[PDB]
Every structure is written in C-alpha cells, then in structure tokens.
C-alpha cells in the first residue's frame, strides 16, 4: 500500500496545523531572545566550523539549517522584513509564531482554519487603521533630531559617547537628506584607539571615520549608530511616527478586544486572540531584561487604558512610562509592516492544508 | 519533527548557561593550580610529540586543544593579556571563572543573567576606581623603573640577571620616550657567551641584544624581559601602581560589598558575589603556595583592615605581610585591564543560551 | 533523616497541584454533560451492581467513586450546595475545575497561587455584590410567572392547552401565597369530559352520609374524629352538644349514630382517608381528637362553606372558605384516568416552579445571562487592579461564560458563536439576556420566564472559588495510606 | 485557675479553647521576656545584616561560615 | 494522579456513544437469526450442565450471563416484551439493535443525541399514529376472541393442548372484565396427569380441621382471621355469635377450639397463608381482623360453594361461588415443574392479548406488512419537516425494514431484491401485502388470513424506540475497580 515517497513524513488535516505551528513557534523563540537593546547575540555554527555572532534574526535564520519547510517560511518573513524596514526582522518573526500560538488552542478543538484566516485577516486590516489615525509627524529640526540620536544611541554600548556620535549622525542625515538614501552614507569602521576620536568626513556624501579599542567596542558602537541613522532617517523620509517600548501594541490589544465584544461569533474570541497575541511585543521586553512580566504587562494595560496611546514599558528603569514624553518614537511604517507581513503571512501558516514531501 | 538538520547542537537557556558556566569555570581552574610564585607547571604535548612545558597560562591555552565555544574566548582573555601588559596572563583567565562560579548561584536565585552584568559591570568600574585611589604615581626615575623591571623578571629563567635586563629595558624605554612606544624597541637573541653579555644596542631604536646558554634559556630571558618592557611601559604610560600579592584584590572585594549595601535593588546580591569572587585569586595564592586558602585569605582579610589595603599574602613568607615594603608591585594598567577582560567576556557568556556546535 | 516514611504519599511541584486540577477537571466535566434542560444523565453502578440513573451533579459524586482526595472536594461542594440551594449543583463543580485550569495558566506564568487567591477572592465579593445590584426583583406579580407555568407544561400532552393550566397555577398559587406551599394545593383528579373544563375549587375537594343531613353549612364547624362511630345515642350527644354541624369520621359510622345525625341535622361522611383529615386540620384548623369523649366545642374548625357539588356529575364534598385560606383545590379534569394522571403530575411541577419565582423576590435571569454580565462587569475590575490580580480576575471572569457555554454544545448551538453574540447583545439589550437553548439564541429570560433566586448564584461562586483556594494553597501534601 | 468556655456547638467551642490557649501563650512569653521584636522579617534581616559584618572582622574560617550563616536568615523574609 | 478511582476504565464522547450502541446492535445480532418460522435454535450452556435449547430471545438473554450494562438493558427490553404480549421478543432486540446501527450513523456526521432522540421520539408517535390509523377491528365474540388467543399459544410447548389453554384465557378473561384486570387471574398448578385435566375455577383455591366438620356449606358467610385459635373457649364464643360457618384462621388452632368450632357446626382451617387471606377478602367480601376480639358480623363475608376437594390425595379447599367472582382460579395441569412453568405463561401471555380482543380488538397484518406502511409513511413525514431532521426520519424509518428484511432473509430468498417488490406493490394495493416466508414471495397477508393484534405491535414500536433513548443518553459509564 505504498502511497508515499521513501521516507516522506506527511500528516493530515488538524495534525498538520500543529506540526506547522508549533515548528514556526519554536523557531522564533530562539531569535526572541535578540530582541530589546540588551539581546543576546548568537554564536551560529555550521558544519565547517565556522562560528558567527550575530544579533539580527535574518543574519541567523539563513544561517541555521532548517529541514522543515515550515520553519522556511519564516526565514522568507525575515527576508522580507530585512529588505523592507531593515530593524525588526526578529519582531516580525517572533509575532507571526505568537498568532500561530492563539489560533492552536481554537484548532485543537474543532475551528476551521480558513475561518480563522478569515478572523486574523480582518484583525490585521483593524490594527493598521489605526495606526494611520494615532501616529505622529512633528519634523529636519537638528534639535528634534539630535535628541533622538541621543535617545537611539542609548541603550547601546555607544550610549557612553553618544553626544558625539549624535551630531555625526544628524550632520551626516542633514546634508543628504532629499529622502535621504542610506547608500549615500558610507561607514568605515577602523577598530583602533577611543570612540571618542570618531569623526564624519563630510557638502553631501559622508564617511563616518570610527575608531575604537577593539572590534568589540568598535562593532557595538557602530551598529548602535546604524540606528540612529535608521530612525533620524525615517522621521525626516516619513513624519509617520508611534510609539515605541510595545505601547502601541497595548492600545492596539485593547481596543482589538473591544471589537471582539462588540464582533459577535467565531471573530470575537478569535480577534481577542489577536490582541492577546500583540502582548508578546511588550512581555518578552521586560524578560530581556530581568523583570517580571506579568506584573509590568498588568500594570501596563491598567496605566495604558487609564493614560493613552503612549504609556509603553520603560526597560531602562523597569516601568511603565509615557514614550511621549520619554522621547521613544520610531516611524509609523515599521508598525504598519509589521502587523502586514507576520499576520497575513501567519495566516497562510494555517491555510496550508497538508504538506506532502518526497526523499 | 526534524525543523532543522541533525548537524547543529542548540541548547535551551539553563541548558546553554549550565554547559558554559562549567565550561569555561573548568578550564580556569586549570591555570589557578599555576597561579603564584609556586605556581605549578603544565605539560602542553601536541599531536606531534613536542612536549611544552610552560606555567603562563597564553602558552597553555595556546597549545591546549579548545573546540569548545566559551573556551575559546577564555583563550582571548589570556592571549591579549599578553599581548597588552603581559604578566599576570593566568589571573584573568582564574578571575573569569571565578565570576561564574560566582554568578551561577545568583543565576539558581533566577536572577536573570542581563541582571547578573549589572552588579558585576557597577562593581567593576568601582573596583578600578578603588585603584586610582590606592595607587602610587612614581615619577626619568631610573630607580623605579629599574625596580619595576625586576619585579617583572623575577621567578624566570632571568631572576639570575634580573639587574642586567633590567637596566637594559629602562634605558630602551627611555631613549624613545619621546610618549613612549614600543614599536621602537626591537630585540633579538643570539647564542654564544651567557646571559650577562646581554646589551643595548643605541635613540628612538635599541636592539636588544640577548645572549645564553640552550636556545630554550634565553627564550625565556626574551620572554621575561618582553614582559619587563610592557610593565615599564605601562608605569610610563600611566603614573599608577599597585601592590599585588593579594592586597588590591582584598581591598576592593570589601569595598565592593560595603558599596553593595549602599545600593539597593538585585544588583546588591552581584556586587557582593562580584567582591566575593575577588578573593578567589588571593584565595588561591595561598594555594599554590601550601598554606591553607581558608586561614590564609581571613588573616590576610583582618590584618588588611589593621594595616590598610597594603598588606597582602607572602607566598614566600607562608602568612600575611605588606607587598609595598616587599616591593611586590604591578602596573595599574595591568590590574585595571584584568578585570576588564575577564569581565566583559564573562558579560557574553550570560548572553548566549544557544551554541550551533560543529563537531 | 529520610524525607518521609513508608507510608507518606509526598506531592510536591507541578505534580501535586496539577494532578489536583486534572481530578478536578475529570470530576467537573463529568457532570458538565447533564447541564441545562437536555442534561445527559448518568447510569451509575456501584459495587453491588446497583443501577442509578440520575442528572443531579451531587447525586452523581455521592455514588461516584472517586480516588483522589482533592478531586473529593467537588463533592463536598457539590454536597453543600444542594442541603443549601439545592440547584446549580452541577455548576459550582464545572466552575470551580475551570477556575482552577485558569489559575495554572498564571502559575504556568511563575505566578505563585497565592497570588491568584487573592484574585479569586476579591473577584468572587465583587461578582456577589453586582448580583444585589442586578436583583430583577420579580412583581404575586403575574405575566412573568404565567410564562413560566407555560414552559412547565410545554413539551407535554398538556401543551395543547397548558396556556389554560398556566393561569390555574398563578392563581392557585397568588390565592395561599404568603413562602409558597406547596403541599397546601389539593389537585383533585377524576376523569370526565375534555382537560378545558379542569378548575380551581376556592377550597378543598374531598372526592354526606346521609341524604337527610344539610348539603350546605355555612360557617362549619368540622369535627374531625379518629375513632369511629360503631359499637350509641349518648355520642351523638357529645358531638350535638358542642355544636359539630361537620364531622369527619376516619373510621366506618354506625347505622344507628347515622340515623342520629340526620335527626339534629348533622352532616357527617365517614371513612375519610386518614391524609384528608389531616388536611382538614390546616385548613379549618379542626383538632384531631381519637376518642369522642374528648371532643370539644374548642376542637371544631371554621369552614366558611362545606357543600356537596356534583362536578362531572359525582358527588364530592368541597370544604371550602376555611378559617385559613392555605387550602385550595384544582379540580382537573381529563377525558381518561391515565389523562389525569400525566397533567396532575404537571400541575406539581408548575406548583414548585411558581414557588422558587415567589420566593426570593431578587431573581435574575439565567440561562447564563448572569454569568456574561459578570464576565464583562470582572473583566474591567481586572483593568482597574494591576499587577497579578489582573489576569486572576480577568480569568476569573473567562471561567464564566462556560455555564452558557455548555449549555448550547447541549443543543447543538455552536457554543463559540451563541456564547459570543450572548455577550454582543448583553451589552445592547441589557442584563435580561441569556441562551434560549429552544430557539437557539440569545432571548429575554426575564420575558420568557427563566429565573434564578439571587441567594443560589451567591454561594456558587463563593463556594466554587473558596474551594479552589484551599486547593491552590495546596503546594506539597504529605498523606499516608 | 479554671475557664469554662461555654459554646452552642463543640466547633465555636473548639476555636475558643484553641484560640484561648494562645492568648495565654502570649503573654507567657511577654513575662518571661518584657521585650518585643517586630516580626515580618526584620530580626532575620537584622542580624544577616550585622552577621556578615561580624565575619569580616571576627577573621578566622568563621567568616565564612558566619556569613552563611547571616544569608541563612534571608530564608524567612 | 487518579482521579475516578484506581484501576477502572474511562470513555469519552467518540467512545461512550459508538460502545453503548454497537454493544446493543450485537447482542441484536445474536437473536436476530431466531427471528421468523424458520428461526434457529441456539443452545446455551450454564455453568452447571443445563442446556438450554431455545429459539425465543428473552430466555436467550435471560441465560447469557451479561457484563456490559448496555446489554443487559437489552435483556430488560425482552423481559418488558415478554411480559406483555409475549412473542416478538426478538423484534423488539432486532430493532432497538437496528435504530443504533444507523444512529451512530449520525453520530459521525456528528449530530448530538439531543437533535436524534427528538426525532425518533416524534418518528415514535408517528408509528403509532398510522397503526392506529391502518390497523383493523376484529370482532370480544368468543369464536374470533378465541382464534386471537390461540394463533399465540401456538408453536410453543403448550401448543399441542393449545385448544384447551385457549378457552381457559377466553374464560378467565371475559371474566375479570369489568378494564380487564390481570391481577385478579389467579393461577394454581399441581403436578399429576396431562395439560388436558386443566380447568378453570370460579374462586379462590385454599391449599376441614375436623373430621366430622361441614365438607360443604350451601351459604357460608367467611370470617377472615389471622390471630391463633390457641392459648379459646370466648374466642371460639365471638365468632359463631357473627352467625358465620367457616372460619380461615392464618396461624394453628387449638384442639380445643376445633371441638368448639366444630361443636357449632362451622369448618375451621388453620395455618392459612397470608396471601390466601388477602384473596378472600377481595372475592368474597370478608375483612380480615387480627383477633377474635374484633370479629363482628360484618367482616363476614359470603360465599355460594365451599367443598373440600382432594386435589391428589391432597385436600384442598375449594371456596368457588363468591358473590363477586371477579377473581378467577386457574388450575393447570403438567407432567412436570418445566411443563408447568411454561404452559403457565403461554396462558398468561394469552390472557394479555384477549384481554385486547375485549378493550381494543385491534389487529395489523403480520409478515411485517405494519412495519413496512409506517416505513413508506414515515418517509412521507420526511419531506413534510424537512431540516436536519429530514434524514433521520428516513433512517429510523428504513430501520423498521429490517423485520421483513430478516424474515425473508430466514427463508433463503433475496432480502434486497423482496424488499423492492415488497415496498412496490405495498405502495399500490394498501398495507394489505407482506413477507410470505412459504413462498418467497409477497403475499396479501390480508387475504391470507395472517393478522396480529395491534398491541402486539404496538409496544413494539414504543419499547424498541424508548431503548434507543436511555442508551443514546448514557454520557459515561464510569464506577470500576
């Protein structure tokens, strides 16, 4: 009765949906830990010996080798976050595996998948809206850009000199900055000395000259930079802005939870999912950290239904905090992908009925 | 199912932390047993037959067969103590174990390893503050140097003409301190006569002519008095200068404890386990040295409260007494640079909890 | 020193308070299948072999045999919960085991249960107080009862014409109203003519000795006597001289005592079944004397009218108007005798319904309304708490909605949905909303006629939670054998 | 001295024998010790506090053990 | 860690319900081929070493020593079926068996009990309507009342005196037929003879305490009494001062009071079973007292024919005549115990379908002619409710095929193919055609003289449906080791 290749492991309907979901799960998690200014850089091995420390979900997903097709699709949402937004990758990949983790206890039970699709499609559309109704657009304001160079540079090792590097950066923006192109700004990295010798070879076309005591203090530094000119990039290119520190995750939570009592059927339990599933965001940046979840994710959603849109988790200090006036914006577009990508993408997950493979 | 090919380990957080914690806490209790005057030597014998004897631990964990990830980083806490102020290459390798053993408990408490770097990291900087404090700034005093370069070839086969090398190096030192460097002090060996024919030859160069018995000798009397060029280097560099045989790290594991009561949060327990793991070196001198770590490091511990910061252990002497009067004094920057290495390394340890292990 | 003996079972960790929850679990999904109107009974067979079908949740666990001690507990819940308020048996049970499978996930959280108790406990006041607040108290009040009977004798024979039988009900019940009793309702079957014609006597109706004594005695005087009346004219002149114009023998009357009493004009019936008399002695409040030596004039009970009609044509005494109108009759009437039998069986159900409605004026409606409303009212608490108690109450308020949500996979109405646009329109037509497991969605309880007293909701939830905490601080248990 | 406790079931009469008999305890112990200590932790941490003070200036392998011995009282609170 | 118990089995949803219905549906299979006149005889084996060789599936059942409760319920069905009507038996298990079969069917489809049941109990009274509806009134008349009593008593051990057993129900119930009561049917067998030496008494049978007392009493009035004659002389006194003649006394009376007794020329029997009292005091009107004491001439009641008889060298008394002869004695004669206990119920089962024949003489072709009009009428009912239910209605419907089915099928020819023909010129030509199992081939049954009376069929239909119930609803069956 042979009706499969030699060696091909193939399970049907509800088994499948596990097998998948759970596979996607596991996956991020190992890039979850990455996340938060303090991740946790992974040392990658292959086969030959070659060992790479890297922070970026991407770097590490194209690195690992993955057998099941499932979990390859994961690495496609992080190459498609990469090449997209840049900063994140491991955001996206890490909340396309939470969505799968609210869905399973529905599939479990008997839910059809696609009604699901149906629900987390409809979800997504929600989210977005209002994040296009809530973002923030102040301004090439040197003065509003350099306290945010210093804000981004924060949180890093170059957070030491991070007045320095701060103007370097706004300066470098300032004079390309049509839309400004990234690939108009080349960084060299010259391990050898202090940061504190760094300068910016500047009219337009720039090369941040960097010098540090070891590749250590030198990469560390640099790629803190490459922040700051990611997000001082942004709000000059789009004015879209949110709030960062997973605030807008916990406005988003809430209110996708207060269409869920109003969204009578299969999408009221489903859509609270959704929301509870956007509490990842703002739950694994308190454990980068060393604090209590639970308490700070309770005490978030009380100070955020009772505050605003901006009350997110102030790592830094372990608390809740008003990214208004703590000065945490980020572009509104990183928010409006991410909510794209690993939710629709998510779905499919589950829409993919059965996967037959050969030897 | 198999989500990634059978050819790379990935361990899950306690599973990781523990495999390093002993790890790297094993191979640096490997160089402790040849830390100290009475320090006990290694037999290195590669795949080839060529057997190394050697007490530093760089030759050692040069030759040493290291695979493992976290060792190999322990391999770079040693090689590039070597590389910068050379002596005491062994302490930072028995210092960084010593804060593992240290924060692996905190880690049984669940205090999380991000946390763990807090009080270590705080601590740390305080330590190499307490030095600046308990540091003497020498003044061309050819006496100090001179005696400096002593204390760096004593013990070697080069403590018979300790005096000639030392008088060597001071002045090659000199003569290109126009702001020294040692890119202008070549040397060079030759066989014929003994080791007190040894000269130099003239200055913003001198070639240091090295002469002795067996080829193996006098790469010890070149290795002795490399390091006696960087000790000196270092004072010259750098106006500070401690007292080792014990007395610093005595002074400042309880000064640490004391600023660790004065700061409240979880980074008290690390700063007290960070002070504490400060005696593991002065601990272990009366190891080496066979008189026991336990009567020895407590004797030493009241009489450094009776005697200020300046009394250490004499491993020569079996018992406490003053290393300032023994004239036992290191560089500054040595010390301060020992506990950075070791730090920061450890510091990446807590933040891996993966490992892709080759093979 | 050895951490314990040869006999001394030591629980510790995940391991004891999990397989508490399970046992729990197990137990409370036991009884979840007969929840609501189409409950799933149970055949239970102990030892012996006996067979015991039964819906009632206590029922079922005092014959259950169960071996985990803390799966024991539900029992004494179960227990405590029907000496109490009897039903809602089941749902303290399901509950209490879904409180629990919520509490895991927060400990699942590194969340020590203390924590969560505290959750429970102030959710569970919480949840009492909005009960006192949401009290629909009910009108003696009519329309809502008269729904009420209708659905008592729906889904019966009687339900061509149980809209005609509800009414008999409400008035039966609104006439010796006072505490509703039950056993004060005299129904009197006899088949005759169509169940249209069955009515409500103002009195009793025993189903005159002799045709000389009067049919019709105004204020009667019942004289109730044990013993009979046989072996003469000296204890006729007992009963005439202390002014019995009514006497109710037990047992058979004399030929001759007969002839007496239609010479002092005395209606008298004999052998009278020994629970009408008793009957006779509430209503009139006639005593109950054995002997006739020792009959009174202070031992006659007052009938405001004792008459004979002829309903369907026979002859029945209808001692009504007594002194203590805590006496009536529902003379029902049916084609056959097996026809009187099946809606007199009816009548009582209704008779008991109508009572819980009367008693305990604050009522809510159920079918799960209550449960939804505190779902939300909880959740929001849990916003205003932080820390812990947030989810605690939170989850607490998500181990509700499972009462209506059983009730509809009990009725093949996709629970998911139905305990959805339960809460949709809860919030948009008010408390009065809940499963209506007939028509398969969300109906007006408080229109239909579906009531809970606001007494069993409170002890439910302070029984299940209470419950679930002692259980929670149950982190190592030691018993041996 | 004798106390008759008087009580409707032997279960309100079980706690007030019971609860009697601390109340008796109590000021046992206030007698035999006209001092007080605030509880909730405060002596454990009091003295794991001056403890591994005491440590490093008693010397000796005591230090140590002292200090353990100090850490050995943050159990409670 | 255990929840329910140690060591006991635990089944859920897809479990309970497949096991409970296969479990019936195979003890169906096992009597299912004893079905028709052409059935086959199965022999069971106790462990003892009695073979029981039967072809009807009650004493089948009642012999296979059951475990799983579900079968056992099966055997509770046969002992309501052969309680009744007798016959059929084995229809009622085949059915019941069936209606499961394509149940589960459903239950795969996934539609809850709730949805099913409903149907099958509103499928249940449609059955019944239409048999009512189709079924045809035979003529009490004792010549056609007689052929109704005999076509049941054959083909059984009594058969062969079938004639004899049938006049002895024709009389004994168009006696005790007011309503004809059962109960008033009182059997008596003793051994010696044939079953031709049978005969049926006017009165109840006692199994002369004085040798010279009265053999025989034109008119004796009876006492009933229970108390002892023993320690006399004033107790002897207050009983022939009641002008009575006979005297049953339940305990032992004194020699002496036998010479008192006798002394009055009255007839004392001592040591007389309680339930002898009883039957007396119901057919000659005579009160049973405790003692003497409290014997009055009213508690005598009043007979026509009281003679000692010798029933096998065994006296019996016999008090026939009574005034109200409602409860007959029937006296059966067998070779043995086996012979006895059998023609008994052949008789008993007899007087039940008589007892039809004088309160609702209702019939319906045989040869499944009913099940097969109910079958084509149900279906029609379908299509007039439409709904989920439109298919269940078919199903239980084509369920009750499975009698003509597995008649046929005992015969050699096709099941299928007479099923077609059968259900085709059953939808032209009336109910009138059935399963012929002589001839392979449908045949009028009508014209063929081949009726049963409606009874017979209908606690079929009600039996084998309401089984379907109380199994559909079993939810678990736990309660082990």
Not at chain 3, 147 to 171: E, P
Request: charged content about 25%.
């Amino acid at each position: 009765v042979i009706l499969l290749k030699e060696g091909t492991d193939s399970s049907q309907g509800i088994p499948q949906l596990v097998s998948n979901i759970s596979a996607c799960q596991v996956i991020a998690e190992a890039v979850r830990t990455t996340l938060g200014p303090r991740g946790m850089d992974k040392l990658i091995v292959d086969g030959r010996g070659k060992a790479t420390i890297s922070n970026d979900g991407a770097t590490i997903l194209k690195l690992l080798d993955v057998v099941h097709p499932a979990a390859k699709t994961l690495v496609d949402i992080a190459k498609s976050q990469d090449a997209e937004v840049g900063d994140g990758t491991t955001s996206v990949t890490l909340l396309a595996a939470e969505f799968l983790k609210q869905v399973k206890p529905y599939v479990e039970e008997g839910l059809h998948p696609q009604i699901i699709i149906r629900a987390f499609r409809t979800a997504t559309q929600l989210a977005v809206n209002k994040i296009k109704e809530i973002a923030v657009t102040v301004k090439e304001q040197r003065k509003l850009l350099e306290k945010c160079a210093m804000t981004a540079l924060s949180s890093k090792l170059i957070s030491q000199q991070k007045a320095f590097f701060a103007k370097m950066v706004v300066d470098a923006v300032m004079m390309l900055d049509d839309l400004l192109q990234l690939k108009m700004i080349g960084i060299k990295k010259v391990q050898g000395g202090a940061l504190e010798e760094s300068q910016l070879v500047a009219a337009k076309t720039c090369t941040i000259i960097l010098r540090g005591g070891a590749e250590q203090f030198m990469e560390e530094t640099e790629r803190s930079l490459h922040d700051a000119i990611m997000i001082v990039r942004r709000a000059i290119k789009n004015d879209s802005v949110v709030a960062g520190g997973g605030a807008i995750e916990m406005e988003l939570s809430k209110y996708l939870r207060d269409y869920s009592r109003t969204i009578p059927g299969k999408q009221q339990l489903l859509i609270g999912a959704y929301a509870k599933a956007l509490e990842i965001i703002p739950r694994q940046l308190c454990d980068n950290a060393g604090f209590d979840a639970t308490n700070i994710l309770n005490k978030l959603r009380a100070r955020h239904a009772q505050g605003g849109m901006w009350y997110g988790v102030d790592i830094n200090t372990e608390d809740i905090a008003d990214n208004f006036e703590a000065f945490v914006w980020e572009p509104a577009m990183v928010r409006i992908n991410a909510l794209t990508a690993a939710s629709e993408a998510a779905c499919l997950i589950v829409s993919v009925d059965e996967t037959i493979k050969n030897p | 199912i198999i989500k990634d090919q059978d050819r790379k380990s990935r361990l899950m957080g306690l599973e990781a932390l523990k495999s390093h914690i002993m790890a790297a806490k094993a191979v640096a209790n490997t160089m402790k047993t040849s830390l100290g005057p009475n320090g006990l030597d290694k037999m290195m014998v590669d795949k080839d037959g060529d057997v190394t004897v050697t007490n530093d631990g760089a030759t050692i964990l040069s030759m040493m067969d290291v695979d493992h990830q976290i060792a190999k980083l322990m391999v770079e806490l040693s090689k590039s103590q070597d590389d910068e102020i050379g002596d005491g290459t062994t302490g930072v390798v028995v210092l960084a174990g010593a804060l593992l053993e240290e924060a692996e408990q905190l880690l049984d408490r669940g205090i999380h390893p991000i946390r763990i770097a807090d009080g270590y990291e705080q601590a740390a900087r305080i330590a190499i503050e307490h030095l600046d404090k308990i540091s003497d700034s020498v003044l061309k005093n050819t006496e100090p140097l001179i005696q400096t370069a002593k204390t760096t070839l004593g013990s070697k086969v080069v403590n018979s003409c300790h005096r000639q090398m030392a008088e060597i190096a001071v002045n090659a030192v000199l003569t290109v301190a126009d702001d020294v460097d040692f890119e202008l002090i070549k040397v060079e060996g030759k066989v014929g006569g003994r080791l007190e024919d040894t000269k130099l030859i003239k200055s913003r160069a001198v070639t240091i002519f090295i002469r002795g018995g067996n080829k193996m000798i006098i790469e010890e009397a070149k290795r002795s008095l490399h390091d006696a060029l960087c000790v000196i280097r270092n004072l010259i560099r750098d106006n500070r200068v401690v007292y080792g045989g014990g007395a610093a790290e005595i002074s400042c594991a309880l000064a640490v404890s004391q600023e660790a009561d004065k700061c409240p949060t979880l980074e008290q327990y690390a700063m007290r386990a960070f002070a504490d793991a400060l005696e593991v070196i002065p601990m272990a001198l009366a190891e080496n040295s066979g008189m026991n770590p336990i009567q020895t490091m407590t004797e030493v511990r009241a009489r450094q409260v009776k005697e200020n910061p300046a009394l250490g252990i004499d491993c020569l002497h079996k018992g406490t007494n003053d290393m300032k009067h023994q004239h036992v004094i290191e560089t500054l920057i040595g010390k301060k640079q020992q506990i950075s290495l070791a730090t920061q390394m450890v510091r990446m340890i807590l933040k891996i909890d993966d490992i892709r292990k080759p093979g | 020193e050895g951490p314990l003996s040869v006999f001394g079972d030591r629980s510790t960790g995940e391991a004891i308070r999990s397989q508490n929850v399970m046992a729990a679990a197990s137990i409370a999904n036991i009884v979840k299948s007969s929840l609501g109107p189409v409950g799933l009974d149970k055949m239970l067979v102990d030892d012996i072999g006996d067979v015991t079908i039964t819906n009632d949740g206590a029922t079922i666990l005092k014959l259950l045999e169960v071996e985990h001690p803390a799966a024991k507990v539900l029992c004494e819940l179960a227990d405590l919960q029907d000496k109490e308020v009897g039903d809602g048996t089941t749902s303290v049970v399901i509950i209490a085991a879904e409180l629990l499978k919520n509490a895991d996930e927060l400990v699942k959280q590194k969340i020590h249960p203390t924590s969560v108790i505290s959750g429970y406990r102030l959710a569970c006041k919480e949840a009492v107080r909005y009960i006192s607040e949401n009290l629909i108290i009910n009108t003696l009040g009519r329309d809502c009862l008269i729904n009420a009977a209708k659905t008592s004798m729906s889904s019966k024979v009687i339900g061509i014409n149980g809209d005609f039988f509800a009414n008999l009900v409400v008035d039966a019940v609104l006439a010796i109203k006072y505490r509703y009793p039950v056993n004060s309702i005299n129904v009197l079957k006899a088949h005759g003519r169509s169940q249209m014609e069955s009515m409500l006597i103002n009195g009793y109706a025993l189903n005159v000795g002799s045709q000389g004594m009067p049919k019709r005695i105004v204020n009667a005087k019942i004289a109730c006597l044990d013993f009979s009346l046989q072996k003469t004219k000296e204890r006729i002149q007992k009963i005439l001289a202390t002014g019995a114009n009514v006497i109710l023998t037990t047992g058979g009357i004399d030929d001759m005592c007969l002839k007496y009493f239609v010479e002092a004009g005395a209606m008298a019936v004999r052998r009278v079944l020994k629970r009408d008399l008793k009957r006779i002695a509430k209503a009139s409040g006639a005593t109950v004397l054995s002997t006739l030596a020792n009959l009174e004039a202070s031992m006659l009970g007052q009938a405001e009218e004792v008459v004979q009609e002829r309903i369907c044509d026979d002859e029945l005494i209808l001692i009504k108007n007594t002194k203590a109108r805590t006496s009536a009759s529902v003379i029902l009437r049916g084609a056959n005798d097996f026809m009187c039998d099946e809606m007199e069986r009816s009548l009582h159900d209704a008779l008991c319904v109508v009572k819980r409605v009367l008693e305990s004026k604050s009522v809510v409606p159920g079918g799960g309304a209550v449960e939804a409303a505190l779902s939300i009212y909880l959740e929001n608490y849990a916003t205003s708490m932080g820390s812990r108690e947030q989810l605690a109450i939170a989850e607490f308020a998500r181990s509700l909605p499972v009462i209506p949500n059983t009730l509809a996979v009990n009725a093949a109405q996709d629970s998911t949905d139905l305990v959805a646009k339960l809460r949709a329109f809860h919030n948009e037509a008010l408390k009065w909303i809940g499963l209506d497991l007939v028509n398969g969605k969300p109906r007006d309880n408080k229109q239909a006629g579906v009531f809970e007293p606001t007494i069993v909701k409170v002890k439910s939830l302070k029984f299940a939670t209470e419950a679930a905490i002692t259980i929670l601080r149950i982190d190592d248990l030691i018993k041996l054998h | 001295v004798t106390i008759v406790v008087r009580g409707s079931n032997k279960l309100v009469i079980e706690e007030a024998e019971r609860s009697i008999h601390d109340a008796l305890c109590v000021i046992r112990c206030l007698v035999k010790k006209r001092a007080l200590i605030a509880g909730g932790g405060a002596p454990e941490i009091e003295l794991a506090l001056r403890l591994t003070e005491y440590s490093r200036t008693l010397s000796g392998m005591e230090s140590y053990c002292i200090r353990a011995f100090a850490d050995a009282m943050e159990v409670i609170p | 860690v255990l929840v329910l118990s140690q060591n006991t089995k635990r089944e859920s949803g897809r479990k309970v319900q497949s096991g409970n219905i296969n479990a019936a549906k195979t003890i169906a299979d096992i009597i299912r081929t004893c079905l028709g006149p052409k059935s086959m005889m199965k022999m069971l084996l106790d462990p003892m070493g009695g073979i029981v060789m039967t072809n009807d599936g009650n004493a089948i059942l009642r012999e296979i020593q059951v475990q799983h409760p579900a079968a056992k319920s099966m055997i509770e069905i046969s002992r309501t079926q052969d309680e009744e009507v007798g016959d059929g038996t084995t229809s009622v298990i085949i059915l019941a068996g069936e209606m499961l079969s394509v149940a589960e069917h459903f239950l795969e489809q996934q539609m809850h009990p709730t949805v099913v049941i409903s149907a099958y109990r509103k499928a249940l009274d449609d059955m019944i309507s239409t048999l009512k509806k189709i079924s045809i009134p035979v003529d009490s008349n004792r010549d056609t009342m007689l052929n109704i009593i005999n076509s049941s008593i054959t083909t059984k051990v009594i058969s062969r005196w079938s004639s004899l057993a049938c006049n002895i129900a024709l009389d004994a119930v168009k006696t005790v037929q007011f309503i004809d009561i059962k109960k008033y049917a009182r059997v008596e067998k003793i051994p010696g003879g044939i079953i031709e030496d049978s005969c049926v008494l006017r009165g109840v049978m006692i199994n002369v305490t004085h040798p010279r007392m009265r053999r025989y009493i034109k008119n004796p009035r009876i006492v009933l009494l229970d108390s002892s004659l023993e320690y006399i002389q004033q107790l002897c006194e207050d009983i022939i001062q009641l002008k009575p003649d006979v005297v049953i006394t339940e305990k032992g009376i004194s020699d002496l009071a036998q010479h008192y007794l006798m002394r009055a020329n009255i007839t004392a029997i001592r040591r007389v079973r309680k339930t002898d009292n009883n039957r007396i005091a119901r057919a000659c009107g005579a009160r049973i007292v405790s003692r003497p004491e409290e014997l009055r001439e009213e508690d005598v009641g009043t007979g026509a024919l009281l003679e000692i008889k010798k029933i096998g060298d065994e006296y019996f008394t016999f008090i026939t005549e009574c005034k109200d002869p409602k409860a007959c004695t029937i006296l059966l004669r067998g070779a043995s115990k086996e012979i006895l206990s059998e023609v008994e119920r052949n008789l008993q089962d007899a007087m039940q379908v008589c007892r039809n024949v004088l309160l609702d003489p209702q019939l319906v072709p045989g040869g499944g002619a009913s099940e097969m009009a109910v079958a084509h009428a149900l279906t029609e009912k379908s299509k007039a409710m439409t709904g989920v239910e439109q298919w269940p209605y078919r199903a239980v419907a084509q369920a009750l095929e499975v009698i003509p089915r597995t008649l046929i099928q005992n015969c050699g020819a096709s099941t299928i193919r007479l099923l077609t023909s059968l259900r085709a010129k059953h939808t032209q030509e009336c109910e009138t055609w059935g399963v012929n199992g002589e001839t392979g081939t449908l045949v009028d049954m009508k014209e063929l003289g081949i009726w049963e009376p409606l009874a017979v069929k209908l606690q079929t239909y009600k039996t084998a449906v309401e089984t379907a119930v109380l199994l559909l609803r079993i939810d678990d069956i736990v309660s082990g080791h």
